[PDB]
Every structure is written in C-alpha cells, then in structure tokens.
Amino acid sequence: ATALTNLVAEPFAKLEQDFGGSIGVYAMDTGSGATVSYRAEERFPLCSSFKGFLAAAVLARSQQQAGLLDTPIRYGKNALVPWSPISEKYLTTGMTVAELSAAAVQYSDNAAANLLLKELGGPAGLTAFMRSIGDTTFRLDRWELELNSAIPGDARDTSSPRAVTESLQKLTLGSALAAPQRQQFVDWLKGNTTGNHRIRAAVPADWAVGDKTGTCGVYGTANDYAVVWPTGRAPIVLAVYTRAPNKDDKHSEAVIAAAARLALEGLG
Numbered sequence: 008a009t010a011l012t013n014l015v016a017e018p019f020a021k022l023e024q025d026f027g028g029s030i031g032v033y034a035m036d037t038g039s040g041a042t043v044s045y046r047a048e049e050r051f052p053l054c055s056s057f058k059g060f061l062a063a064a065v066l067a068r069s070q071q072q073a074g075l076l077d078t079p080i081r082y083g084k085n086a087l088v089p090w091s092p093i094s095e096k097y098l099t100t101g102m103t104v105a106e107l108s109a110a111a112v113q114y115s116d117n118a119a120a121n122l123l124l125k126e127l128g129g130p131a132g133l134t135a136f137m138r139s140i141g142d143t144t145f146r147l148d149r150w151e152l153e154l155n156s157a158i159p160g161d162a163r164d165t166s167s168p169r170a171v172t173e174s175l176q177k178l179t180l181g182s183a184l185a186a187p188q189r190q191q192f193v194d195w196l197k198g199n200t201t202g203n204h205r206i207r208a209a210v211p212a213d214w215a216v217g218d219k220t221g222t223c224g225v226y227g228t229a230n231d232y233a234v235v236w237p238t239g240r241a242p243i244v245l246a247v248y249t250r251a252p253n254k255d256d257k258h259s260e261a262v263i264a265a266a267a268r269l270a271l272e273g274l275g
C-alpha cells in the first residue's frame with residue numbers, strides 16, 4: 008500500500024489556516040526516496056531565494072569559462088540598491104564574481120544579484136540555466152527590486168516548492184555540476200547568515216545545513232530552502248514557501264520553521 012497523503016498533509020492545513028495564507032512544502036529523503044508534499048506544485052514568489060540558483064548558474068558558467076570566479080566586476084554607484092550590505096562596502100574597488108556570489112547567497116545582497124544577472128544575460132539567462140537542468144517551473148522575469156512585488160495571481164518570478172527542491176538536489180547532491188563547483192555551491196549555502204530562524208531552527212545543532220531565504224515583505228510572502236546532512240546518513244533536501252492574499256498579511260519565520268519541522272519529522 009502507498010502513503011495516506013491526507014494524514015501526511017493535515018498538519019500543514021492547520022498551520023496555514025492560523026497563518027491566514029498558503030504554505031507550500033516539498034521534502035525529499037535522499038536515503039529512502041521518501042517525500043513529504045503539500046501544495047508542492049503551486050507557484051509561490053521566489054523573492055531573494057533565486058540568488059542560490061543564480062550562484063549555481065555562475066558556477067556552471069565557470070566550467071566553460073576558466074577563471075570566471077576570479078573576474079573583477081568594478082561597478083558604479085547606480086548598481087547600489089537597498090539591501091546590498093556587502094556591495095555597498097566595495098564601491099571604491101569592485102568585487103570578484105566569487106565575492107559577489109558569496110554575498111548574494113549569504114547576505115542576500117541585491118546589487119550583487121543584479122550584477123551577476125547581468126553577467127549571465129539577465130533574468131532570462133538564469134531561467135535558461137534552470138531549463139538546462141530540467142526545471143520547467145522556475146521563472147525569473149524581473150530584476151531586483153521589482154521581482155519582489157509578489158502580487159497574487161502573478162506568475163512572474165515564481166517557482167514551486169517541488170521544483171526548487173528537485174533543482175537544489177540536482178545541483179548540490181547530484182552531478183549536475185562538476186564536483187569542485189558542487190562543493191562550492193554547498194559551502195556558500197552552508198555559510199548563509201540569514202536563515203537561523205527558518206529551516207535551521209527545526210534541525211538539531213549537530214547537523215550541517217545549507218540554505219537560502221527569501222522575504223518579499225508583502226502578501227505574507229517568504230521562504231527558505233535547504234539541504235540538511237544528518238550525521239551518518241543520507242541528506243534531506245526541502246523547500247518551504249508562503250504567500251497570503253492581502254498585501255498587509257504578515258510573513259512568519261516561525262511558520263516556516265514549524266512547517267520545516269513537520270516536513271522533516273514526517274519523512275520515511
């Protein structure tokens with residue numbers, strides 16, 4: 008017999024009703040193939056969370072272009088947009104592509120993300136990279152800061168929890184990238200500084216986590232995705248996305264952490 012997905016799903020429905028919105032979750036246990044799934048194929052805004060995949064796209068390009076990660080990007084003052092705390096420090100020198108990538112992933116730096124998008128041929132170039140690894144759901148259409156609008160019913164700048172999880176697995180654990188690039192992506196995710204109150208909060212401190220967060224700041228829209236390495240057994244990949252119908256509906260980190268915990272405890 009197969010899993011009773013109603014019983015797996017029920018606690019997410021209670022959680023999202025207290026939240027006043029929708030919660031989407033997909034988790035995969037790479038040891039057993041077990042999954043947990045709730046609204047996993049619905050679209051949610053990416054917000055900042057695209058920046059993880061952006062860094063992966065940069066790493067893929069570095070496989071065709073030796074030394075890409077070493078290349079300095081020397082930008083002018085109009086690259087600077089708010090929530091760019093790392094790129095704002097280096098206006099007088101520039102930053103390398105590696106530094107920009109680290110900042111985009113680990114501080115969610117907005118200007119760094121735009122600078123890397125430009126290197127890859129814009130939002131369409133990142134979307135094309137995702138299509139190359141078989142993700143037909145992901146779409147990035149706009150740039151920082153407009154991509155955060157999170158308007159209900161807008162398909163722009165969205166993906167699904169399942170597609171995010173599947174793509175994250177391919178890139179971090181599968182062989183979609185060469186091993187050095189794969190480990191770099193993992194190391195950048197592991198060094199994230201913005202995720203302590205989201206998926207990380209549901210994971211024992213003994214276990215390594217790499218993640219990328221997103222917070223659109225409107226329509227209850229926020230998210231996190233992660234790889235979790237429990238000691239001595241197969242890693243877990245998961246994504247938790249939220250949205251809500253009213254512009255002034257609050258996002259909640261506690262709800263993301265709670266949904267992560269329900270997903271992790273429900274596997275296998």
Ligand SMILES: *C(=O)N1C[C@H](NOS(=O)(=O)O)CC[C@H]1C(=O)NNC(=O)[C@@H]1CCNC1
Nearest residue numbers: 054055090115152155201220221222223224
């Ligand atoms: C990503 O979603 N953003 C970058 C910053 N870090 O948050 S997080 O670690 O990724 O969760 C800040 C949140 C957000 C972002 O860019 N916020 N800025 C806005 O969305 C602008 C104000 C309202 N619309 C544009």
